């Protein structure tokens, strides 16, 4: 309902969640689930928690699209509405 999840993929194989944290500690989601198996992770962000501070977490997320992370560059996009 009041969250939207942020579709990052493409990560190294030997991911940890130090690198992960680090990464979007300035957008500062509420739930992080790494799934290697597939170099993909889930990152939910409360909407309640700011009605208008949702807006920038997300964009701060989604300038994430095309870094680069150990040594690998990496995706990130929407996953809610498609």
């Known amino acids: ?3 939207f999840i942020v579709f990052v993929g493409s990560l190294p194989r030997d991911i940890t969640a130090v690198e992960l944290q ?4 300035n957008s500062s ?3 992080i689930r ?8 889930f990152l939910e962000f409360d ?3 700011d009605r208008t501070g ?5 964009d701060i997320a989604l300038l994430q699209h095309g870094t680069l992370l150990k ?7 929407l996953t809610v509405g498609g």
Not at 22 to 25: E, G, L, Y
Not at 34 to 41: N, T
Not at 54 to 58: A, D, E, G, H, S
């Open 47 to 49: 909407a309640d928690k």
């Open 54 to 58: 949702i807006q920038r977490r997300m």
């Open 71 to 77: 040594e690998k560059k990496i995706n990130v996009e």
């Open 34 to 41: 790494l799934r290697a198996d597939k170099g993909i992770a």
């Open 29 to 31: 989601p509420d739930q």
């Open 1 to 3: 309902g009041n969250r």
């Open 22 to 25: 680090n990464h979007f500690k």
